[PDB]
Amino acid sequence: DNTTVFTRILDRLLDGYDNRLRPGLGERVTEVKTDIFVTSFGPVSDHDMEYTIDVFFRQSWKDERLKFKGPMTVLRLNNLMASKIWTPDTFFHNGKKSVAHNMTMPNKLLRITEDGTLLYTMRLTVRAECPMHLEDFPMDAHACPLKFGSYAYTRAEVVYEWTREPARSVVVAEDGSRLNQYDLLGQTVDSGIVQSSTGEYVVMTTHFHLKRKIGYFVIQTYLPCIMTVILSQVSFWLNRESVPARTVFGVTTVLTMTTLSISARNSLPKVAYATAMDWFIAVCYAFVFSALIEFATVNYFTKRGYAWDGKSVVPEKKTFNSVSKIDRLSRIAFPLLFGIFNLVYWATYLNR
Amino acid sequence: DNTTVFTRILDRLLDGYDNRLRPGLGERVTEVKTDIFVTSFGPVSDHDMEYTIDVFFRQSWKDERLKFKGPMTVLRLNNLMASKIWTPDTFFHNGKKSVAHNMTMPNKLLRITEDGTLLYTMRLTVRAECPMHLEDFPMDAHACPLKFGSYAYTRAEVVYEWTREPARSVVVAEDGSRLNQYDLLGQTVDSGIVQSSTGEYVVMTTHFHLKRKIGYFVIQTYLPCIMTVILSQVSFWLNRESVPARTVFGVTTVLTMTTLSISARNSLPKVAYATAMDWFIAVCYAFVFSALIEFATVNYFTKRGYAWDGKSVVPEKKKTFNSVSKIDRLSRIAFPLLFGIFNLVYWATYLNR
Amino acid sequence: NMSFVKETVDKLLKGYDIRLRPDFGGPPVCVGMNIDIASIDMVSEVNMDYTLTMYFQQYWRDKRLAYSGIPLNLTLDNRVADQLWVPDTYFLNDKKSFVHGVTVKNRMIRLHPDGTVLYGLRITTTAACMMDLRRYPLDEQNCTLEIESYGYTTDDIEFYWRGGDKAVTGVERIELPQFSIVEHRLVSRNVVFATGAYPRLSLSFRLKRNIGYFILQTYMPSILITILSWVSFWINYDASAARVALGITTVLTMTTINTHLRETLPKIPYVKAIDMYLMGCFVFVFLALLEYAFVNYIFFGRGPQRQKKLIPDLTDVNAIDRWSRIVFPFTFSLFNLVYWLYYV
Amino acid sequence: GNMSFVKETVDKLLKGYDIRLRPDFGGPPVCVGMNIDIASIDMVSEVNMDYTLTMYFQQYWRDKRLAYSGIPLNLTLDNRVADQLWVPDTYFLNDKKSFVHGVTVKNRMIRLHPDGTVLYGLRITTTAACMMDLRRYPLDEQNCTLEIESYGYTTDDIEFYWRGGDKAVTGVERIELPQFSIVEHRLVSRNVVFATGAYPRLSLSFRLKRNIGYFILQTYMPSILITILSWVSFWINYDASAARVALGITTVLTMTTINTHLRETLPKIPYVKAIDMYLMGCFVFVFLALLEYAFVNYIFFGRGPQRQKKLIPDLTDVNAIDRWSRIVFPFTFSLFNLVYWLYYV
Amino acid sequence: GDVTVILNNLLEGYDNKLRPDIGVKPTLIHTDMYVNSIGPVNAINMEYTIDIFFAQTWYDRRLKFNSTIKVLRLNSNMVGKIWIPDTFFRNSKKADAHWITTPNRMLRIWNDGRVLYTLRLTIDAECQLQLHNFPMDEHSCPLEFSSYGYPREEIVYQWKRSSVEVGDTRSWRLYQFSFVGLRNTTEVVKTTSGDYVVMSVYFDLSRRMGYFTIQTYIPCTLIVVLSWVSFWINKDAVPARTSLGITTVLTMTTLSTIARKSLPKVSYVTAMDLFVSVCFIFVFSALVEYGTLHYFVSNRKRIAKMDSYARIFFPTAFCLFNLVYWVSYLYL
Ligand SMILES: *[C@@H]1O[C@H](CO)[C@@H](O[C@@H]2O[C@H](CO)[C@@H](O[C@@H]3O[C@H](CO[C@H]4O[C@H](CO[C@H]5O[C@H](CO)[C@@H](O)[C@H](O)[C@@H]5O[C@H]5O[C@H](CO)[C@@H](O)[C@H](O)[C@@H]5O)[C@@H](O)[C@H](O[C@H]5O[C@H](CO)[C@@H](O)[C@H](O)[C@@H]5O)[C@@H]4O)[C@@H](O)[C@H](O[C@H]4O[C@H](CO)[C@@H](O)[C@H](O)[C@@H]4O[C@H]4O[C@H](CO)[C@@H](O)[C@H](O)[C@@H]4O[C@H]4O[C@H](CO)[C@@H](O)[C@H](O)[C@@H]4O)[C@@H]3O)[C@H](O)[C@H]2NC(C)=O)[C@H](O)[C@H]1NC(C)=O
Ligand SMILES: CCCCC/C=C/C/C=C/C/C=C/C/C=C/CCCC(=O)O[C@H](COC(=O)CCCCCCCCCCCCCCCCC)COP(=O)(O)O[C@@H]1[C@H](O)[C@H](O)[C@@H](OP(=O)(O)O)[C@H](OP(=O)(O)O)[C@H]1O
Ligand SMILES: CCCCC/C=C/C/C=C/C/C=C\C/C=C/CCCC(=O)O[C@H](COC(=O)CCCCCCCCCCCCCCCCC)COP(=O)(O)O[C@@H]1[C@H](O)[C@H](O)[C@@H](OP(=O)(O)O)[C@H](OP(=O)(O)O)[C@H]1O
């Protein structure tokens, strides 16, 4: 048959081949050209401080032992042949539990050119650590890294390079975005050397720049807190003799702010420093507490336990209580100070 | 080399060896001596009615096919040798999902003595069923079993035995305890026979006796309920004309008891019967509700809508004033006394046993 | 005669090169595909994916596996699939998948006299599905499964749906608790990557969400507290404690409902339809409370001034209460009409 | 360094190699040196009582069967050759779940040297049990250890030692945890008897100190603020019963809810923690404030007509009792806070 | 040994790729099952766990041998050497065999070529639940299996006598359900591959109502009684009765939200939803009754005696509703 020629070629290539030895062992440095096609940038987990990414990871090198002459210029072979030859032992330095997909078959391809050039591509899902600083949360930006290199071979044996110019060697698919509360602004690419106990190794690095979206936390945390502050300040417009009503205002607003403060930190990890949202919630709590203390101060100076009746008349300075000066000043002071605080906060943090 | 003699001995032992056949096939019964070293008694899961245990499980038997003579009395071989010879097919009858540890290499050892005695040990994490009767929860005790035996070989082919006396053949490490809300009182060891449609099999059984610790539930459930009952009873000491205050007392106490009752049945599985804590919560709810009905009955007999002015003296029996309710004065004594009596009876009944 | 079949199979497997596809240097090999859907489960908005169980069957021709003298379609033990070439099919949007393996690997290989091969697998796959929740819970979603060859380009392999539109079956029998499958589609095309062009098949479903659960769970309680907030308009103006407590309880209940409703979803940055409805209800109850506050102010903080000196008129609490009684239900009904007309 | 010569040398080395036997079978024990590079510590869990650890674990030992002359360089071989050589049966005793990373290939390293020395490296993520004493939680310090041991080989067969002494373990100073700070790490070598023999044991222990800022933001400050809120009742008139009762009841319920919510996110341990004691003290304070209001209300209404017919602070005037409480409650709370924070810090 | 040579002779020239009687007649498999336990029923995911010992018997002429030994009893080692049926469970979401300490498999071969093959299995099987009558609902959950590759012309299954056995059900992990009984059936199903013999076992389960009685019904009834308590309070105490009404309404809303957490997000009304809705209607009616009483007595100026009528009407109506509901659901 016509396929017996290729069987003979493949048998000749693997005759005497030793996959335990890299190409050019003891003669030259094996050079591997790598690049990445991100099919989808997975979701970011703030609690675990990590992210997921799905990639076509492809490498290319030269093996003089695998050159041939035949009717075809390039052999596109079954992926099991990749187990019969030497391949680089690339690994992700900051990688957590990762997956090499093998449904239905191993998601790999190997192609051999007549001059001995090997191309080797494989589909991966990588979970990688992204250490985050959350001082400016929920208005923070991050540069999540992705580092890879050889596990066993030092720089004197294996060196990595980008296939094309480094900016163009990491390509993100247009529709490949699984981010919910982040925007992928872009990426930067670099390479370097890392020392360790075993030796010096080449490391290839990418940094993806992410910007958090603020809408969810605006709806979830900021708006309820602002409404609670306004609800607390509403009590200044009631008559001073309605003690139970204003007490109910104060206690309910304080409890609402306490519950919001407790529930606002559920998403994040248990960091030891205060975020921007913590400062906002603390200031709102101070405002509602101040409103309750203002009511207590007003009540301390109330003399008569009965409110004004709709028939009599109050002479100016059966007598009646006068409207509190503290309330009349608070109606102006509290909203104005809250507005000034909001201006300062949203000016300093959004334009940071 | 000096090690060539051992290679020759090992090749000679495996030459013609058939691992498909048990030792002594068609001649006698294969006797396996077993024992267990519990490195740590794992946590107990009430929701799944299971428990975890980490063990060195080790077995010993005799195989005349592996007799040898050489400079060494005992060969301590790699775990990969075990796959080349017959070993018992022991399995746990009540096991759910166990693990054989592989890091860094398969955690097994095989030792061969010159007379042909085989010692075979492995490290396992066994998850086993522990059916529980939660009637006396959180003051209940359990006897969690661990049963194992051969899967394929009947009593006429393989029989299990304990290496030492049965009490001393299951050894728990002193520092190896991972129990949060239980105390391991002890263990009982036994052996017996089980019958199936395929034949009779030998079963080796252990029973670990566990007793629950009540401190967490005392801090979590009992104390809030008692304080809620006391808070409800506090309402009797206010004047009868403070209708909104006493209504707030009753409503808040009732809702707190409802929330406590709802949140109590979260640690346990969704069993269809009532536990002791359910009875305690029910009685406390009854007390709180009775306090609210007491306030309603008191308010039914209040005539004047205003309280005492603070200056006028009431007649011994002008402006009249409501007298202090007799129902309040008698309830102040009645409610705490009956609650204390109930607490005495409940705690004595459920702790004396 | 079992010996003849054994010799035939041994002859077929002898000298078979698994590394080479059928017609390695020749034209591309055509692979037909069909699917039998067994179940769809766990359509998760939090994870943005869905689980799918199926019988996935592939059909092709291998001249090397042709035999004669046995008028039968030889069904063989599935382990022989390890010794034959099969397509390197894969799913791009799959995240986690496996082949069921009890009692044995649920795999089928069947040969025919003319070298035709039928290869079936039982696969459970968790496929990604990005959802647009702007119209949630009145939203329709499109969820797809991509099928592609990894190593073989269009010069080496070709995919087609076996049976045309009937290539996928069992969709009508699927039942989801929260969705109804209104339509499914089959597409065949090509996709170009830097390594070349590859064939692609695509199986898409359109899912429509059921609304009864949210009516029972979310909308009716919100309407109930909104109606309850209007009871304050019938209470006497001087009973400040009762009206204030009613308004505060309604406002806090609405806020708690909104928060606990939004907490069971992904942290999306945009507003949903149900968020709009809950915000409207919050505005209504807040306006009721502010209406009582305005009534109390206009009475107490302005009665002495009016006495010293001397839409409805802004000087009578009864007029304001009657106006609120008339206007609040009407405006709420109008808001409901507009909201339900827009989103349906 | 012709590749054919290297292939011949490797084939000669692996010809007649008995993987079943250790390097000095029947001879003295083989010494195995160990060292670790800690990449990260991920999830210190109080609920599960374990911690996750990613590391590069390297072992060093001499095997005379693998000595080779000729080629003057160290042969870094493909990791699959590890399946054809003898390696130690090292394992971790307190491990619950572990795996070797396997992308793109099995992250394993085999390096041979001319004198028969072998360097064997793995990248391991391991979850290890750590039983934590939470009596002083969240002001607690924990000790978490990794116990390395030989399974099948006794002290007559294998000996362990920390290669490089105290410099064996590296990268601890670079670790950053959100809730904990690593104060110290220690290395120990020991022997352990198991009734099948005495085995060598290495132990890598870390000491972790918890960070207090999260709990100050989350737990202590709300409780202090609620306790301060409860004192507002003393500034309201005795006759305003509804307001004072609502204030006290609200504070009591809030304290109870905070305590339950805090305790529902931790293991069901039987003993009392420091945070539990603090919250119980705050609960006692707010309960005493509510009881103070109940007492003054009773003293006025129930026992006023009797004294009218008849005709520490003085327990006859409610105003005196309120004035006394206004001073005593903050002072007692400050004293309690001082005692608590001096004891637990 | 004699057994060693017997096994070597049996395996000589043996092709495990070919079923016995290939091209001659269908292979008849006799199936047997012992249920160790039926695990929990997960209503959210609509599945249940089951642990079984599964045994299959069939004749293979290639394994005939003549000797004084009547039976060869073998462990898992030789399972991979001979032909084995490719039985699989049709409605299995997830299944697994047991592998500790060794594979839990057993093989036995007779002189006449009869092979018995047994293994231990843990299966998660989907069970579609109709929760209209929840928590008074009963279900019939199936477990189906068949050959994956061999249609009815090649493999046929048969049940034997007293096929399905169950141990002591007291140790089972059924909390919310009680095991009523079981039954077996066999049928033929047509697929694109051909016609296959499907063998099914149905287990009948009935829900136990104690947990939901403790959790949902009693709190709702108690809150309804709490709402009734308002009728005896004086009509002048506006804040107290308003507080009672609003607190009852909010508590009923919270209980309604909590009650459905156990169920899946079904789009139809269950019995529990009906009960909770009626309780909500009752408390809302009580609050509206007080509202209209307050408006008529004071704000405007038989109507004044509305509390006396309500005290009789509300409890009697609630008792009638409870009687009708329980009689309709439990019996009819
Ligand atoms: C995608 O990629 C995936 C990974 O990259 C891939 O998954 C892997 O696929 C392979 C092949 O399909 C699977 O291998 C099969 O596994 C069977 C056992 O399976 C279960 O057990 C494994 C772990 O198995 C080890 O542990 C058990 C005990 O726990 C031992 O019994 C095993 O021998 C084996 O041994 C070691 O490990 C122990 C602890 O781990 C050590 O203590 C011990 O010392 C050993 O070192 C689990 O991982 C499995 O989990 C998964 O899979 C199921 C589905 O099946 C999932 O539901 C689940 O969630 C998990 O994901 C599972 O629990 C093996 O029995 C099997 O090998 C037999 O058959 C083949 C032929 O098919 C033979 O070639 C082979 O030699 C084996 O046969 C002999 O032994 C059997 C049993 O005794 C005999 O019946 C038989 O006749 C034969 O006897 C002959 O040879 C013997 C040789 O020693 C001789 O001694 C005898 O005397 C006799 O002559 C096969 O290896 C593998 O499990 C998958 N998973 C992994 C993680 O690798 C997946 O398929 C890919 N997908 C696709 C679509 O491509
Ligand atoms: C980050 C949040 C910031 C929020 C924004 C801040 C906002 C801050 C600003 C808000 C507005 C502030 C206004 C305060 C200024 C007061 C001057 C005007 C009133 C004034 O003079 O105050 C006095 C007492 O003085 C105080 O103790 C009053 C002084 C103490 C005031 C304490 C206020 C408590 C709240 C402050 C903030 C919080 C404090 C607590 C801090 C802790 C929590 C954070 C009370 O004045 P009055 O109007 O209440 O009472 C009159 C007055 O007593 C007359 O003398 C009396 O008549 P005569 O007896 O005949 O003389 C009237 O009786 P009749 O009814 O019979 O006619 C009374 O009705
Ligand atoms: C799980 C175990 C729980 C155990 C709970 C604790 C269990 C142990 C607790 C025991 C309860 C404590 C003490 C029992 C009470 C003693 C009965 C005293 C009856 C009695 O004398 O009370 C009467 C009538 O009351 C009834 O007919 C109706 C009286 C009904 C009886 C009291 C009901 C108390 C609430 C019971 C709720 C029970 C609810 C059960 C629900 C089911 C739970 C399973 C009202 O006495 P009063 O002092 O309130 O009113 C007087 C009275 O009406 C005078 O006749 C009237 O003077 P005149 O009109 O001149 O004759 C006064 O007017 P002035 O203000 O102008 O001076 C009134 O002020």
Ligand SMILES: CCCCCCCC/C=C/CCCCCCCC(=O)O[C@H](COC(=O)CCCCCCCCCCCCCCC)COP(=O)(O)OC[C@@H](O)CO
């Ligand atoms: C949020 C609420 C805050 C309220 C706080 C208010 C502050 C005042 C309370 C301080 C409590 C101090 C902590 C209590 C102790 C912590 C709980 C505890 O561990 O006690 C165990 C025994 O309990 C037991 O017998 C359980 C039985 C004792 C039950 C205690 C409640 C007594 C109720 C009496 C009725 C009075 C009615 C009066 C009404 C007028 C100790 O056993 P032992 O070491 O051997 O381990 C064996 C194994 O069972 C685990 O303990």
Ligand SMILES: CCCCCCCCCC
């Ligand atoms: C099949 C859809 C049933 C939806 C029921 C909705 C009931 C709403 C009651 C207010």
Ligand SMILES: [Cl-]
């Ligand atoms: Cl995201």
Ligand SMILES: [Cl-]
């Ligand atoms: Cl425990």
Ligand SMILES: [Cl-]
């Ligand atoms: Cl169940």
